[PDB]
């Protein structure tokens, strides 16, 4: 057979190769000095999807025969829990792959060596429950609200000429979001128009449709009715049936029934004094005439997600067949008007008394890079949520790493002769991160390690690699803080994934063709 089977060192190399390739591209992306890449692929690949976020591309493609896609895959969970914020975990994991050659030199029991992960277990556990992340965030928080981590996530990000401002707004959003609400009811999109502003925060929900061109322009003191049951009429669950009659006269009654549906809609809508009908699904037309006549606006097929958020925003109802008006509903009235943004016409539901949910309408010149806003906004949303939840962070800019490197170095000898070697390799691995951030900086790296190691060993924890400074600076001042989450999950994830590669010996796969 053509099945590819590898054992021992050959199998290890497969693992050896995968980590290295990822690191150069990944390494370049990091933080303030990080870079954007464009990936063009043939079908099914439309163009070059440029991505500031490392994770997205990794998730998207399982390009070649080298194993790794699974490795790539895990990081997503870390982002759900946290992120992000900026890719870093993978590179460090990759470097760990490095010593095993010296490990061939170890020429003893590699599995004995794996005792490293327990050490990592230690290493990971210790900063966890040890040392410090973040103090106050009084809340909502005047100032602490942003110009920080949002900008750091954004840092590697291409967007942040304008982007830092975008990232900054995110904290306002988090502030509105705060409470036991969980994460829900926030809607985002971007727009094809220019404004230095680059984006808008809407006090309510933004949607895009028209009931009828006919109908009224804007609605005030709007009575909002959401309907589960679209207006469509006739059939049931017996078609009952395609049909014929004891004279055309009989048909007259059938025509009459539609009127009943119509009349019912007209009768109670008026009592409400009805302004708007949002039907997350197609509507049946007699109301179409009646509404336009009415002073009311329908949104035929207003898709569901925004309907639910709009529930959170408004007061709602229970809708609910046509008994749905009124108090069955709760309609919120600031103003619902269809406006032109630029550009495409959207409907703005606003002055929601609730305030629990809002929207962000991005504005951009336009393009896939505008779609970079698409790359962008998501990144921004997750990090903020984590920061709010954790109530814990860490000094960014290489601070954390340098400290861990110092502490970890103690660890190998803290461990025994065999174990020391493994544990020490783990610690040294810590060193690259100082090399990388600084390297993106444009400053000489070797000096970077030395100065940074001195400042950190000092215990001035806050000192990090200040790219701006070009040396090591006070991260606290800069505001680069890493979520407590990012560091923790990376430590844990890194050990396990690395071991799995190493733990497995005989790698088996069949030839595609």
mmCIF file with all atom_site columns, N, CA, C and O in Angstrom, residues 141-186:
data_model
loop_
_atom_site.group_PDB
_atom_site.id
_atom_site.type_symbol
_atom_site.label_atom_id
_atom_site.label_alt_id
_atom_site.label_comp_id
_atom_site.label_asym_id
_atom_site.label_entity_id
_atom_site.label_seq_id
_atom_site.pdbx_PDB_ins_code
_atom_site.Cartn_x
_atom_site.Cartn_y
_atom_site.Cartn_z
_atom_site.occupancy
_atom_site.B_iso_or_equiv
_atom_site.pdbx_formal_charge
_atom_site.auth_seq_id
_atom_site.auth_comp_id
_atom_site.auth_asym_id
_atom_site.auth_atom_id
_atom_site.pdbx_PDB_model_num
ATOM 1   N N  . UNK A 1 141 ? -16.282 52.940 34.726 1.00 0.00 ? 141 UNK A N  1
ATOM 2   C CA . UNK A 1 141 ? -14.923 53.330 34.728 1.00 0.00 ? 141 UNK A CA 1
ATOM 3   C C  . UNK A 1 141 ? -14.783 54.415 33.750 1.00 0.00 ? 141 UNK A C  1
ATOM 4   O O  . UNK A 1 141 ? -14.787 54.174 32.544 1.00 0.00 ? 141 UNK A O  1
ATOM 5   N N  . UNK A 1 142 ? -14.512 55.568 34.326 1.00 0.00 ? 142 UNK A N  1
ATOM 6   C CA . UNK A 1 142 ? -14.332 56.746 33.616 1.00 0.00 ? 142 UNK A CA 1
ATOM 7   C C  . UNK A 1 142 ? -13.447 56.429 32.515 1.00 0.00 ? 142 UNK A C  1
ATOM 8   O O  . UNK A 1 142 ? -13.763 56.037 31.420 1.00 0.00 ? 142 UNK A O  1
ATOM 9   N N  . UNK A 1 143 ? -12.244 56.549 32.939 1.00 0.00 ? 143 UNK A N  1
ATOM 10  C CA . UNK A 1 143 ? -11.084 56.393 32.104 1.00 0.00 ? 143 UNK A CA 1
ATOM 11  C C  . UNK A 1 143 ? -10.585 55.008 31.860 1.00 0.00 ? 143 UNK A C  1
ATOM 12  O O  . UNK A 1 143 ? -10.118 54.709 30.764 1.00 0.00 ? 143 UNK A O  1
ATOM 13  N N  . UNK A 1 144 ? -10.657 54.109 32.858 1.00 0.00 ? 144 UNK A N  1
ATOM 14  C CA . UNK A 1 144 ? -9.981  52.846 32.711 1.00 0.00 ? 144 UNK A CA 1
ATOM 15  C C  . UNK A 1 144 ? -10.605 52.113 31.583 1.00 0.00 ? 144 UNK A C  1
ATOM 16  O O  . UNK A 1 144 ? -10.026 51.163 31.060 1.00 0.00 ? 144 UNK A O  1
ATOM 17  N N  . UNK A 1 145 ? -11.808 52.563 31.184 1.00 0.00 ? 145 UNK A N  1
ATOM 18  C CA . UNK A 1 145 ? -12.608 51.919 30.195 1.00 0.00 ? 145 UNK A CA 1
ATOM 19  C C  . UNK A 1 145 ? -11.768 51.568 29.000 1.00 0.00 ? 145 UNK A C  1
ATOM 20  O O  . UNK A 1 145 ? -11.843 50.418 28.586 1.00 0.00 ? 145 UNK A O  1
ATOM 21  N N  . UNK A 1 146 ? -10.936 52.454 28.392 1.00 0.00 ? 146 UNK A N  1
ATOM 22  C CA . UNK A 1 146 ? -10.197 51.831 27.320 1.00 0.00 ? 146 UNK A CA 1
ATOM 23  C C  . UNK A 1 146 ? -8.843  52.439 27.060 1.00 0.00 ? 146 UNK A C  1
ATOM 24  O O  . UNK A 1 146 ? -8.117  52.786 27.988 1.00 0.00 ? 146 UNK A O  1
ATOM 25  N N  . UNK A 1 147 ? -8.482  52.586 25.762 1.00 0.00 ? 147 UNK A N  1
ATOM 26  C CA . UNK A 1 147 ? -7.156  52.960 25.337 1.00 0.00 ? 147 UNK A CA 1
ATOM 27  C C  . UNK A 1 147 ? -6.177  51.997 25.937 1.00 0.00 ? 147 UNK A C  1
ATOM 28  O O  . UNK A 1 147 ? -5.127  52.408 26.427 1.00 0.00 ? 147 UNK A O  1
ATOM 29  N N  . UNK A 1 148 ? -6.486  50.683 25.894 1.00 0.00 ? 148 UNK A N  1
ATOM 30  C CA . UNK A 1 148 ? -5.627  49.728 26.537 1.00 0.00 ? 148 UNK A CA 1
ATOM 31  C C  . UNK A 1 148 ? -5.485  48.491 25.700 1.00 0.00 ? 148 UNK A C  1
ATOM 32  O O  . UNK A 1 148 ? -4.947  48.503 24.594 1.00 0.00 ? 148 UNK A O  1
ATOM 33  N N  . UNK A 1 149 ? -5.983  47.373 26.266 1.00 0.00 ? 149 UNK A N  1
ATOM 34  C CA . UNK A 1 149 ? -5.888  46.047 25.732 1.00 0.00 ? 149 UNK A CA 1
ATOM 35  C C  . UNK A 1 149 ? -6.540  46.047 24.385 1.00 0.00 ? 149 UNK A C  1
ATOM 36  O O  . UNK A 1 149 ? -6.126  45.342 23.471 1.00 0.00 ? 149 UNK A O  1
ATOM 37  N N  . UNK A 1 150 ? -7.600  46.844 24.224 1.00 0.00 ? 150 UNK A N  1
ATOM 38  C CA . UNK A 1 150 ? -8.291  46.910 22.976 1.00 0.00 ? 150 UNK A CA 1
ATOM 39  C C  . UNK A 1 150 ? -7.311  47.349 21.924 1.00 0.00 ? 150 UNK A C  1
ATOM 40  O O  . UNK A 1 150 ? -7.289  46.819 20.814 1.00 0.00 ? 150 UNK A O  1
ATOM 41  N N  . UNK A 1 151 ? -6.475  48.347 22.252 1.00 0.00 ? 151 UNK A N  1
ATOM 42  C CA . UNK A 1 151 ? -5.454  48.848 21.378 1.00 0.00 ? 151 UNK A CA 1
ATOM 43  C C  . UNK A 1 151 ? -4.368  47.833 21.216 1.00 0.00 ? 151 UNK A C  1
ATOM 44  O O  . UNK A 1 151 ? -3.651  47.868 20.225 1.00 0.00 ? 151 UNK A O  1
ATOM 45  N N  . UNK A 1 152 ? -4.109  46.995 22.240 1.00 0.00 ? 152 UNK A N  1
ATOM 46  C CA . UNK A 1 152 ? -3.072  46.012 22.081 1.00 0.00 ? 152 UNK A CA 1
ATOM 47  C C  . UNK A 1 152 ? -3.515  44.916 21.154 1.00 0.00 ? 152 UNK A C  1
ATOM 48  O O  . UNK A 1 152 ? -2.720  44.432 20.348 1.00 0.00 ? 152 UNK A O  1
ATOM 49  N N  . UNK A 1 153 ? -4.789  44.475 21.248 1.00 0.00 ? 153 UNK A N  1
ATOM 50  C CA . UNK A 1 153 ? -5.244  43.420 20.380 1.00 0.00 ? 153 UNK A CA 1
ATOM 51  C C  . UNK A 1 153 ? -5.145  43.969 19.014 1.00 0.00 ? 153 UNK A C  1
ATOM 52  O O  . UNK A 1 153 ? -4.600  43.359 18.094 1.00 0.00 ? 153 UNK A O  1
ATOM 53  N N  . UNK A 1 154 ? -5.627  45.207 18.911 1.00 0.00 ? 154 UNK A N  1
ATOM 54  C CA . UNK A 1 154 ? -5.616  45.970 17.718 1.00 0.00 ? 154 UNK A CA 1
ATOM 55  C C  . UNK A 1 154 ? -4.232  46.188 17.267 1.00 0.00 ? 154 UNK A C  1
ATOM 56  O O  . UNK A 1 154 ? -4.022  46.444 16.084 1.00 0.00 ? 154 UNK A O  1
ATOM 57  N N  . UNK A 1 155 ? -3.278  46.163 18.208 1.00 0.00 ? 155 UNK A N  1
ATOM 58  C CA . UNK A 1 155 ? -1.927  46.531 17.912 1.00 0.00 ? 155 UNK A CA 1
ATOM 59  C C  . UNK A 1 155 ? -1.432  45.827 16.688 1.00 0.00 ? 155 UNK A C  1
ATOM 60  O O  . UNK A 1 155 ? -1.106  46.481 15.699 1.00 0.00 ? 155 UNK A O  1
ATOM 61  N N  . UNK A 1 156 ? -1.412  44.483 16.692 1.00 0.00 ? 156 UNK A N  1
ATOM 62  C CA . UNK A 1 156 ? -0.891  43.776 15.559 1.00 0.00 ? 156 UNK A CA 1
ATOM 63  C C  . UNK A 1 156 ? -1.735  44.121 14.392 1.00 0.00 ? 156 UNK A C  1
ATOM 64  O O  . UNK A 1 156 ? -1.261  44.116 13.258 1.00 0.00 ? 156 UNK A O  1
ATOM 65  N N  . UNK A 1 157 ? -2.998  44.478 14.678 1.00 0.00 ? 157 UNK A N  1
ATOM 66  C CA . UNK A 1 157 ? -4.010  44.708 13.700 1.00 0.00 ? 157 UNK A CA 1
ATOM 67  C C  . UNK A 1 157 ? -3.708  45.912 12.855 1.00 0.00 ? 157 UNK A C  1
ATOM 68  O O  . UNK A 1 157 ? -3.217  46.934 13.329 1.00 0.00 ? 157 UNK A O  1
ATOM 69  N N  . UNK A 1 158 ? -4.006  45.764 11.546 1.00 0.00 ? 158 UNK A N  1
ATOM 70  C CA . UNK A 1 158 ? -3.786  46.680 10.461 1.00 0.00 ? 158 UNK A CA 1
ATOM 71  C C  . UNK A 1 158 ? -4.653  47.877 10.609 1.00 0.00 ? 158 UNK A C  1
ATOM 72  O O  . UNK A 1 158 ? -4.281  48.997 10.268 1.00 0.00 ? 158 UNK A O  1
ATOM 73  N N  . UNK A 1 159 ? -5.851  47.654 11.148 1.00 0.00 ? 159 UNK A N  1
ATOM 74  C CA . UNK A 1 159 ? -6.847  48.664 11.212 1.00 0.00 ? 159 UNK A CA 1
ATOM 75  C C  . UNK A 1 159 ? -6.405  49.844 11.994 1.00 0.00 ? 159 UNK A C  1
ATOM 76  O O  . UNK A 1 159 ? -6.905  50.936 11.742 1.00 0.00 ? 159 UNK A O  1
ATOM 77  N N  . UNK A 1 160 ? -5.536  49.654 13.011 1.00 0.00 ? 160 UNK A N  1
ATOM 78  C CA . UNK A 1 160 ? -5.376  50.650 14.036 1.00 0.00 ? 160 UNK A CA 1
ATOM 79  C C  . UNK A 1 160 ? -4.654  51.905 13.659 1.00 0.00 ? 160 UNK A C  1
ATOM 80  O O  . UNK A 1 160 ? -3.739  52.358 14.350 1.00 0.00 ? 160 UNK A O  1
ATOM 81  N N  . UNK A 1 161 ? -4.955  52.471 12.479 1.00 0.00 ? 161 UNK A N  1
ATOM 82  C CA . UNK A 1 161 ? -4.676  53.866 12.392 1.00 0.00 ? 161 UNK A CA 1
ATOM 83  C C  . UNK A 1 161 ? -5.899  54.446 13.043 1.00 0.00 ? 161 UNK A C  1
ATOM 84  O O  . UNK A 1 161 ? -5.868  54.992 14.143 1.00 0.00 ? 161 UNK A O  1
ATOM 85  N N  . UNK A 1 162 ? -7.050  54.202 12.376 1.00 0.00 ? 162 UNK A N  1
ATOM 86  C CA . UNK A 1 162 ? -8.364  54.496 12.834 1.00 0.00 ? 162 UNK A CA 1
ATOM 87  C C  . UNK A 1 162 ? -8.671  53.438 13.832 1.00 0.00 ? 162 UNK A C  1
ATOM 88  O O  . UNK A 1 162 ? -9.431  53.655 14.771 1.00 0.00 ? 162 UNK A O  1
ATOM 89  N N  . UNK A 1 163 ? -8.058  52.250 13.679 1.00 0.00 ? 163 UNK A N  1
ATOM 90  C CA . UNK A 1 163 ? -8.573  51.187 14.485 1.00 0.00 ? 163 UNK A CA 1
ATOM 91  C C  . UNK A 1 163 ? -8.474  51.380 15.942 1.00 0.00 ? 163 UNK A C  1
ATOM 92  O O  . UNK A 1 163 ? -9.356  50.911 16.650 1.00 0.00 ? 163 UNK A O  1
ATOM 93  N N  . UNK A 1 164 ? -7.440  52.058 16.449 1.00 0.00 ? 164 UNK A N  1
ATOM 94  C CA . UNK A 1 164 ? -7.376  52.149 17.878 1.00 0.00 ? 164 UNK A CA 1
ATOM 95  C C  . UNK A 1 164 ? -8.603  52.812 18.431 1.00 0.00 ? 164 UNK A C  1
ATOM 96  O O  . UNK A 1 164 ? -9.070  52.438 19.503 1.00 0.00 ? 164 UNK A O  1
ATOM 97  N N  . UNK A 1 165 ? -9.181  53.784 17.703 1.00 0.00 ? 165 UNK A N  1
ATOM 98  C CA . UNK A 1 165 ? -10.386 54.425 18.153 1.00 0.00 ? 165 UNK A CA 1
ATOM 99  C C  . UNK A 1 165 ? -11.492 53.410 18.196 1.00 0.00 ? 165 UNK A C  1
ATOM 100 O O  . UNK A 1 165 ? -12.289 53.385 19.134 1.00 0.00 ? 165 UNK A O  1
ATOM 101 N N  . UNK A 1 166 ? -11.565 52.537 17.173 1.00 0.00 ? 166 UNK A N  1
ATOM 102 C CA . UNK A 1 166 ? -12.600 51.544 17.103 1.00 0.00 ? 166 UNK A CA 1
ATOM 103 C C  . UNK A 1 166 ? -12.436 50.667 18.292 1.00 0.00 ? 166 UNK A C  1
ATOM 104 O O  . UNK A 1 166 ? -13.398 50.302 18.965 1.00 0.00 ? 166 UNK A O  1
ATOM 105 N N  . UNK A 1 167 ? -11.182 50.289 18.582 1.00 0.00 ? 167 UNK A N  1
ATOM 106 C CA . UNK A 1 167 ? -11.048 49.343 19.631 1.00 0.00 ? 167 UNK A CA 1
ATOM 107 C C  . UNK A 1 167 ? -11.463 49.980 20.896 1.00 0.00 ? 167 UNK A C  1
ATOM 108 O O  . UNK A 1 167 ? -12.032 49.298 21.740 1.00 0.00 ? 167 UNK A O  1
ATOM 109 N N  . UNK A 1 168 ? -11.212 51.297 21.036 1.00 0.00 ? 168 UNK A N  1
ATOM 110 C CA . UNK A 1 168 ? -11.527 52.037 22.227 1.00 0.00 ? 168 UNK A CA 1
ATOM 111 C C  . UNK A 1 168 ? -13.003 52.050 22.522 1.00 0.00 ? 168 UNK A C  1
ATOM 112 O O  . UNK A 1 168 ? -13.391 51.977 23.687 1.00 0.00 ? 168 UNK A O  1
ATOM 113 N N  . UNK A 1 169 ? -13.868 52.148 21.495 1.00 0.00 ? 169 UNK A N  1
ATOM 114 C CA . UNK A 1 169 ? -15.292 52.249 21.701 1.00 0.00 ? 169 UNK A CA 1
ATOM 115 C C  . UNK A 1 169 ? -15.793 51.016 22.368 1.00 0.00 ? 169 UNK A C  1
ATOM 116 O O  . UNK A 1 169 ? -16.728 51.069 23.162 1.00 0.00 ? 169 UNK A O  1
ATOM 117 N N  . UNK A 1 170 ? -15.139 49.876 22.109 1.00 0.00 ? 170 UNK A N  1
ATOM 118 C CA . UNK A 1 170 ? -15.580 48.586 22.547 1.00 0.00 ? 170 UNK A CA 1
ATOM 119 C C  . UNK A 1 170 ? -15.825 48.622 24.018 1.00 0.00 ? 170 UNK A C  1
ATOM 120 O O  . UNK A 1 170 ? -16.722 47.944 24.514 1.00 0.00 ? 170 UNK A O  1
ATOM 121 N N  . UNK A 1 171 ? -15.020 49.382 24.771 1.00 0.00 ? 171 UNK A N  1
ATOM 122 C CA . UNK A 1 171 ? -15.231 49.418 26.186 1.00 0.00 ? 171 UNK A CA 1
ATOM 123 C C  . UNK A 1 171 ? -16.531 50.068 26.540 1.00 0.00 ? 171 UNK A C  1
ATOM 124 O O  . UNK A 1 171 ? -17.150 49.711 27.541 1.00 0.00 ? 171 UNK A O  1
ATOM 125 N N  . UNK A 1 172 ? -16.990 51.052 25.750 1.00 0.00 ? 172 UNK A N  1
ATOM 126 C CA . UNK A 1 172 ? -18.269 51.635 26.031 1.00 0.00 ? 172 UNK A CA 1
ATOM 127 C C  . UNK A 1 172 ? -19.299 50.559 25.885 1.00 0.00 ? 172 UNK A C  1
ATOM 128 O O  . UNK A 1 172 ? -20.230 50.463 26.684 1.00 0.00 ? 172 UNK A O  1
ATOM 129 N N  . UNK A 1 173 ? -19.151 49.706 24.852 1.00 0.00 ? 173 UNK A N  1
ATOM 130 C CA . UNK A 1 173 ? -20.096 48.655 24.609 1.00 0.00 ? 173 UNK A CA 1
ATOM 131 C C  . UNK A 1 173 ? -20.099 47.715 25.777 1.00 0.00 ? 173 UNK A C  1
ATOM 132 O O  . UNK A 1 173 ? -21.159 47.257 26.201 1.00 0.00 ? 173 UNK A O  1
ATOM 133 N N  . UNK A 1 174 ? -18.909 47.401 26.333 1.00 0.00 ? 174 UNK A N  1
ATOM 134 C CA . UNK A 1 174 ? -18.836 46.465 27.422 1.00 0.00 ? 174 UNK A CA 1
ATOM 135 C C  . UNK A 1 174 ? -19.550 47.050 28.595 1.00 0.00 ? 174 UNK A C  1
ATOM 136 O O  . UNK A 1 174 ? -20.230 46.351 29.345 1.00 0.00 ? 174 UNK A O  1
ATOM 137 N N  . UNK A 1 175 ? -19.402 48.369 28.779 1.00 0.00 ? 175 UNK A N  1
ATOM 138 C CA . UNK A 1 175 ? -20.018 49.059 29.871 1.00 0.00 ? 175 UNK A CA 1
ATOM 139 C C  . UNK A 1 175 ? -21.505 48.938 29.746 1.00 0.00 ? 175 UNK A C  1
ATOM 140 O O  . UNK A 1 175 ? -22.202 48.699 30.729 1.00 0.00 ? 175 UNK A O  1
ATOM 141 N N  . UNK A 1 176 ? -22.053 49.106 28.531 1.00 0.00 ? 176 UNK A N  1
ATOM 142 C CA . UNK A 1 176 ? -23.483 49.020 28.438 1.00 0.00 ? 176 UNK A CA 1
ATOM 143 C C  . UNK A 1 176 ? -23.927 47.625 28.758 1.00 0.00 ? 176 UNK A C  1
ATOM 144 O O  . UNK A 1 176 ? -24.986 47.418 29.346 1.00 0.00 ? 176 UNK A O  1
ATOM 145 N N  . UNK A 1 177 ? -23.118 46.632 28.346 1.00 0.00 ? 177 UNK A N  1
ATOM 146 C CA . UNK A 1 177 ? -23.369 45.223 28.464 1.00 0.00 ? 177 UNK A CA 1
ATOM 147 C C  . UNK A 1 177 ? -23.343 44.771 29.907 1.00 0.00 ? 177 UNK A C  1
ATOM 148 O O  . UNK A 1 177 ? -24.042 43.830 30.277 1.00 0.00 ? 177 UNK A O  1
ATOM 149 N N  . UNK A 1 178 ? -22.546 45.427 30.775 1.00 0.00 ? 178 UNK A N  1
ATOM 150 C CA . UNK A 1 178 ? -22.305 44.916 32.101 1.00 0.00 ? 178 UNK A CA 1
ATOM 151 C C  . UNK A 1 178 ? -23.531 44.648 32.916 1.00 0.00 ? 178 UNK A C  1
ATOM 152 O O  . UNK A 1 178 ? -24.531 45.365 32.876 1.00 0.00 ? 178 UNK A O  1
ATOM 153 N N  . UNK A 1 179 ? -23.444 43.535 33.678 1.00 0.00 ? 179 UNK A N  1
ATOM 154 C CA . UNK A 1 179 ? -24.477 43.023 34.532 1.00 0.00 ? 179 UNK A CA 1
ATOM 155 C C  . UNK A 1 179 ? -24.513 41.542 34.295 1.00 0.00 ? 179 UNK A C  1
ATOM 156 O O  . UNK A 1 179 ? -23.736 41.010 33.502 1.00 0.00 ? 179 UNK A O  1
ATOM 157 N N  . UNK A 1 180 ? -25.434 40.844 34.986 1.00 0.00 ? 180 UNK A N  1
ATOM 158 C CA . UNK A 1 180 ? -25.597 39.417 34.920 1.00 0.00 ? 180 UNK A CA 1
ATOM 159 C C  . UNK A 1 180 ? -26.316 39.030 33.667 1.00 0.00 ? 180 UNK A C  1
ATOM 160 O O  . UNK A 1 180 ? -26.820 37.913 33.563 1.00 0.00 ? 180 UNK A O  1
ATOM 161 N N  . UNK A 1 181 ? -26.395 39.951 32.691 1.00 0.00 ? 181 UNK A N  1
ATOM 162 C CA . UNK A 1 181 ? -27.116 39.764 31.464 1.00 0.00 ? 181 UNK A CA 1
ATOM 163 C C  . UNK A 1 181 ? -26.564 38.622 30.670 1.00 0.00 ? 181 UNK A C  1
ATOM 164 O O  . UNK A 1 181 ? -27.292 38.053 29.858 1.00 0.00 ? 181 UNK A O  1
ATOM 165 N N  . UNK A 1 182 ? -25.250 38.331 30.810 1.00 0.00 ? 182 UNK A N  1
ATOM 166 C CA . UNK A 1 182 ? -24.580 37.309 30.050 1.00 0.00 ? 182 UNK A CA 1
ATOM 167 C C  . UNK A 1 182 ? -24.147 38.044 28.830 1.00 0.00 ? 182 UNK A C  1
ATOM 168 O O  . UNK A 1 182 ? -24.210 39.271 28.809 1.00 0.00 ? 182 UNK A O  1
ATOM 169 N N  . UNK A 1 183 ? -23.660 37.350 27.785 1.00 0.00 ? 183 UNK A N  1
ATOM 170 C CA . UNK A 1 183 ? -23.311 38.119 26.629 1.00 0.00 ? 183 UNK A CA 1
ATOM 171 C C  . UNK A 1 183 ? -24.401 37.937 25.627 1.00 0.00 ? 183 UNK A C  1
ATOM 172 O O  . UNK A 1 183 ? -24.628 36.823 25.157 1.00 0.00 ? 183 UNK A O  1
ATOM 173 N N  . UNK A 1 184 ? -25.108 39.038 25.282 1.00 0.00 ? 184 UNK A N  1
ATOM 174 C CA . UNK A 1 184 ? -26.191 38.927 24.347 1.00 0.00 ? 184 UNK A CA 1
ATOM 175 C C  . UNK A 1 184 ? -26.629 40.307 23.942 1.00 0.00 ? 184 UNK A C  1
ATOM 176 O O  . UNK A 1 184 ? -26.336 41.294 24.610 1.00 0.00 ? 184 UNK A O  1
ATOM 177 N N  . UNK A 1 185 ? -27.406 40.367 22.841 1.00 0.00 ? 185 UNK A N  1
ATOM 178 C CA . UNK A 1 185 ? -28.077 41.531 22.319 1.00 0.00 ? 185 UNK A CA 1
ATOM 179 C C  . UNK A 1 185 ? -27.199 42.596 21.720 1.00 0.00 ? 185 UNK A C  1
ATOM 180 O O  . UNK A 1 185 ? -27.665 43.722 21.543 1.00 0.00 ? 185 UNK A O  1
ATOM 181 N N  . UNK A 1 186 ? -25.946 42.294 21.326 1.00 0.00 ? 186 UNK A N  1
ATOM 182 C CA . UNK A 1 186 ? -25.149 43.329 20.713 1.00 0.00 ? 186 UNK A CA 1
ATOM 183 C C  . UNK A 1 186 ? -25.019 43.001 19.250 1.00 0.00 ? 186 UNK A C  1
ATOM 184 O O  . UNK A 1 186 ? -24.681 41.873 18.890 1.00 0.00 ? 186 UNK A O  1
#
